[PDB]
Amino acid sequence: YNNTSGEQMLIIWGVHHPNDETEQRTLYQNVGTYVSVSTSTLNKRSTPETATRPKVNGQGGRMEFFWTLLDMWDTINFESTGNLIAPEYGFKISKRGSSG
Amino acid sequence: ATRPKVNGQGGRMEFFWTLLDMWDTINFESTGNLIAPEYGFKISKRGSSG
Numbered sequence: 001y002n003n004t005s006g007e008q009m010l011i012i013w014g015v016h017h018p019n020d021e022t023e024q025r026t027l028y029q030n031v032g033t034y035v036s037v038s039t040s041t042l043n044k045r046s047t048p049e050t051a052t053r054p055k056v057n058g059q060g061g062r063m064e065f066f067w068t069l070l071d072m073w074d075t076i077n078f079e080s081t082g083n084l085i086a087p088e089y090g091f092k093i094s095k096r097g098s099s100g
Numbered sequence: 101a102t103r104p105k106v107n108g109q110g111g112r113m114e115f116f117w118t119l120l121d122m123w124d125t126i127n128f129e130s131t132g133n134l135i136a137p138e139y140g141f142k143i144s145k146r147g148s149s150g
């Protein structure tokens with residue numbers, strides 16, 4: 001993505017930590033997966049790991065979520081060989097202010 | 101990995117800094133990608149700067 005809207009855009013994405021090697025492959029058909037997210041200042045290469053985790057809501061795997069800001073014409077690059085949970089919706093901030 | 105073209109380069113330099121306190125032998129080991137220091141900055145004095 002190339003920033004166009006003229007303000008910091010909150011881009012929020014995530015990665016999936018599957019609970020089973022079989023479940024990992026049945027979702028992504030490969031292992032040793034990585035999710036790279038790079039901007040003009042941010043660089044983050046998460047490596048999802050499949051391991052036995054306590055049953056929460058019936059699932060063992062989790063979602064790690066990250067958030068970032070595309071400041072000003074800062075092109076963001078998502079790259080992955082799986083496990084990525086992409087954002088289809090970037091939250092541009094309309095205004096500054098004083099909230100809580 | 102593919103990174104946005106900054107100054108024509110995609111790759112970056114991560115930089116770290118550390119303090120060798122007192123006869124603390126430092127060991128750099130690498131099979132590549134290391135950017136070594138040939139210059140250690142000893143601090144002459146304490147003080148109050150800004």
Ligand SMILES: *[C@@H]1O[C@H](CO)[C@@H](O[C@@H]2O[C@H](CO)[C@@H](O[C@@H]3O[C@H](CO)[C@@H](O)[C@H](O)[C@@H]3O)[C@H](O)[C@H]2NC(C)=O)[C@H](O)[C@H]1NC(C)=O
Pocket residue numbers: 002003004073074075
């Ligand atoms: C896509 O991302 C780039 C990030 O580099 C945004 O920056 C724009 O990049 C273009 C070249 O790709 C440049 O435009 C230049 O404008 C000057 C103004 O006189 C002109 O003389 C040049 O011929 C060239 O057209 C410039 O670095 C920059 N444009 C700006 C800041 O207005 C680019 O805006 C992004 N594309 C979008 C948002 O559509």
